[model samples]
Target: EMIPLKFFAVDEVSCQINQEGAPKDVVEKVLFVLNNVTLANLNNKVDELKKSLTPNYFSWFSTYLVTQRAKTEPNYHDLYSKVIVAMGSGLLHQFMVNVTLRQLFVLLSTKDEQAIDKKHLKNLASWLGCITLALNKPIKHKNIAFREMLIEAYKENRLEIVVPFVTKILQRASESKIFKPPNPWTVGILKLLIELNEKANWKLSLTFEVEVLLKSFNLTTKSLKPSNFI
Candidate 1:
């Protein structure tokens, strides 16, 4: 008497939604699930949903989760982070992280003025930071490279984007308690902050929050600057 389960193929190579086609039903159902997911039901929902997914879908879904969903709903980034964690910390989780990081790089690397929307840029940056903190791993090399990219962006006068991006990452790091002093990632962040403070004449809005974060680490910009000069 039980109804049969309806499984959808999320990995059809020919399926493209924007340019590459995806099953319409699959996309619709995924969006529906994303829309309705809550902290209370997150585990059960993601557990059930993962049953029908494949690696290909993970790539597509992760990209969509950030570039589309996260971009549009910035406030729900923490929820998105929870949902990703709920997907399990195996290959799927790694895929989501790698894909999202790639998306972040692409967004920051865009050279055309008309190609990147400022608002969308900040949303994607914040969402990536949330995911990084949620994972609670150093992601050391990637973070260092990303910090360099942000520095390059700042040098190009993209302070509006770089400031929020770094702020969100540091804020999430503070809340997660994963960015303590002497951690390699924290060192990188401190260096970046020093660079920002020096280059911007300490006038950037992130100055206050960065100061507080440094204080929590029992460090000061003045103390950090000596090392940078060496």
Candidate 2:
């Protein structure tokens, strides 16, 4: 083993320069390292994730068209500070993007400890911490003042509005596909879409969501499949 000093200096050095302007990869590596070593409990882990949840996420995500995160194919930001903040808010979003709900469903529901991975377990711990952190905080968008802030993202040609438009595609997918194990991930994604719609007074149905969840129940130990989002 050697000194941890190397990484700190390395990341900081990397962060000093870039065309868009910072050493993001260096920062990402630092976040990953910190996530693994510093977070021990769920509460602690969530606090760590909160680091990623700056006003920056909404800023970056809302202005999806212009941000570095939105260029070309887009960067999902493996471990940005905003991600940490959102992780502090709730794991549901991360669950969908990260390990999927399989970790949550299995780790909480099953007694089979052997099936789990420690890194994934660590992420779960971080997410649980996020849930606790969320209780103490109000989602920024849910607040009255931020009302225009949310819609302005779309109107200003910042956010693509593509993410919010999954309803039609989801419905079509549901009507056409008789996926063997079904597609509960689709259900969860749809459910999220419906809530967004409800908040916006945009009417979208939950039929696809329900159907997808039903399909999720059919899978077991032998049937783990790729996330539908990919």
Candidate 3:
């Protein structure tokens, strides 16, 4: 008879954090804040976590904050962005932004058949948009990354991905106090939209949405010419 291999079972709590060597107490504290944090208490809770946990511990905390909860709790997406920005420009803050952008780019770059589920993609894209707008000052490099990826997607005729992704970001940008008119990022996006419109012969539905986004910035597609197309 062949020998049978024994399989170990993982518990729910054990599977939740998934980061090796993370302290149980730290994980628990992070979980506690995630579970109980609200708009009114968000800053206090962030400060508490910052004061209690060492900087190194934030590696796990930042990963957990961005990856978990937001999937199941849609409203938490915005809250999580706020939490990340509240963490300030520390190492972990940079780490969270990098992690978020990496995930977003991965999702955007994957093959269609191998794509992540739509619900998760929607939430991640929305969360990325929130983070981008919330950390607008520090996100210029990230904005360029987004613009490059999106323009590539449009060039490849991957409108299925580009449309929703652009919509999510533009929606957040429109509502952001920091992303105002004449912003280089928005101008780059408008250039991409104009090029996309040219490619689609002006029939793309995203054209309309981009028009509205530009109007929010007091811009119009006709008023802005792509500087490179001469």
Candidate 4:
């Protein structure tokens, strides 16, 4: 007629033994063992899976790896310098700046085959498009606050927070691959949005913007933009 207190005991209940059937209790137990198990945890797990899927042969996607290679391989220096020069040329194209930015984000953030795999380019485009739609009605984007947030985050090396969020901007930009991004006046206004720290931000040192900045980062430059990004 009545349940015993033993029935409520974690070990007796065995929620850990079968989580699928008892999601609420199992999740609570998992959370008890893990410090955190929410959206961020899920993201960390997803990224981990992506990283595992990436190949060791990949080089262009990550700046960290590129520099690391520069030390061990003699040709890497030339290769690295070539990449730098390529990024410079990319920004000048004027139209695909957002695409360039997306590539850069993937490189700066994931920088591995897993995150920016063959399918990632299209995924980023689609994701960014979704983001743009989320920011709808405003029509006029490129706000100072937004850029400042991105720049400040960059200075802090907080790509974890900024990169995914920036994807939508890149995606929306890709939809209009050929259209000239709002002119230099609009560009200038957009530039003012980033809160720049001269000491912390190195990319900002550049005088010009690339058309499809992030392409090289995600290994997409070969298909679009000016020459080699890697």
Residue 124 error, candidate 4, Å: 6.3
Task: Report the lDDT tens digits of candidate 2 across residue range 93-158.
Answer: 332223322333343333333454433433443332232222232122221112232244324331
Worst 10 residues of 3 by lDDT: 2-11
Poorest 10 consecutive residues by lDDT, candidate 1: 1-10
lDDT score, candidate 4, position 49: 30
Candidate 1 per-residue lDDT over residues 79-175, each given as its tens digit:
8888777777455555555665565555555656467676776676667667776457554452335466455556566555556556655655655
Ranking by lDDT: 1, 3, 4, 2
Q: Pick by TM-score: which candidate is best?
A: 3
> For all the candidates, what are their Cα RMSDs to the real structure?
10.5, 19.0, 9.6, 20.9
Runs in model 3 lying further than 4 Å from the true structure: 1-21, 138-147, 175-178, 201-230
Backbone-clash count (model 3): 0
Give RMSD (Å) of candidate 2 vs. truth.
19.0
lDDT of each: 0.63, 0.32, 0.62, 0.32
Reference-based TM-score of each model: 0.70, 0.21, 0.71, 0.25
Candidate 4's residue-wise lDDT over 1-230, tens digit each? 22112111111111122112223543344224223323434445434333332322122223222223322343233233333233332221121223333343444345343454433443433333332322231222442134444555555554343434344343344334332234342233233322122233434312112223333123232333221111
lDDT of 3 by residue, 1-230 (tens): 11111111111221222234457887787778878889999999989877656666655665666677654466887787777778774566655655665555556556662455656666766676677674564355523355565555555666666556665666567666677546677677677766666665534566776676677667777888763431
TM-score of candidate 2 relative to the true fold:
0.21
> What's the true lDDT of residue 171 in model 4?
33
